[PDB]
Design a protein around this nucleic acid. Structure first.
Length: 49
DNA sequence: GGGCAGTCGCCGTGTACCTCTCCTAGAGCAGCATGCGCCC
């Protein structure tokens, strides 16, 4: 595959985490929960918060 | 066809604690206690 490096930002990088529980409790609860429900995500409870 | 550029709508905006008040809805329908008129 090909790729290109990117520079994200403090709030864009924190909304792309692997756990939907930690992202839902930060900002934009409804959009995050809707996307997680559509994708059928699961959370394995790693890290604080 | 291929757009640039412009516009519109949604998201976000530090932490703990103390005191005073007002409100849980509002209109229809029937029961009741009161005031006043009536017949003896």
């Amino acid at each position: 595959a090909q790729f290109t490096p990117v520079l994200l930002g403090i709030t864009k990088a924190s909304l792309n985490t692997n756990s939907f529980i930690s992202a839902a409790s930060f900002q934009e609860t409804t959009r995050v929960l809707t996307e997680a429900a559509i994708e059928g995500k699961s959370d394995w409870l790693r890290g604080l918060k």
